[PDB]
Amino acid sequence: QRCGSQGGGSTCPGLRCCSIWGWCGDSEPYCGRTCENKCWSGERSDHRCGAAVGNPPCGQDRCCSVHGWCGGGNDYCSGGNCQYRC
């Protein structure tokens, strides 16, 4: 769906990446070099995520767990275990 500067100013569902073209997605064109917001490179050095730190993104193949940390695998990414970028 649409997002960001080219797409009305919105934030993507599931806090996914918004590309410079104003579309949401989870792959390189959206999240890498041509990303505008909630980009892979935007993960905090401390790996925290969630509402308390302003809903930052997580890196590639990482998700924000319900406990408030980015990481890879089932404990961060699977249903119930995951809050966004699942």
Give me the resolution in angstroms, 1 decimal.
1.4
User: In sequence order, what are the residues at sequence separation of 6 or more whose Cβ sits closer than 8 angstroms to the Cβ of residue 67?
Assistant: none
| Token pair for 70 | 């980015």
DSSP state of 63: E
Which ranges of 1-86 would DSSP assign to H, the alpha helix? 28-31, 74-77
CA distance 66 to 82: 5
Amino acid (one-letter) located at 75: D
Q: First CA to last CA across the chain, in angstroms?
A: 17
Q: How many residues make up the chain in this entry?
A: 86
Q: What residue type is 41 in one-letter code?
A: S
Method: X-ray
CA angle 1/38/53 to nearest 5° reads 125
**Residue 46: burial class (beta carbons within 10 Å; 0-12, 13-18, 19+):** exposed
Q: How far apart are CA 23 and CA 3, in angstroms?
A: 6
Gap between the Cα atoms of 16 and 39, Å rounded: 8
Going 54 to 13 to 70 to 58, the CA torsion angle's sign is negative
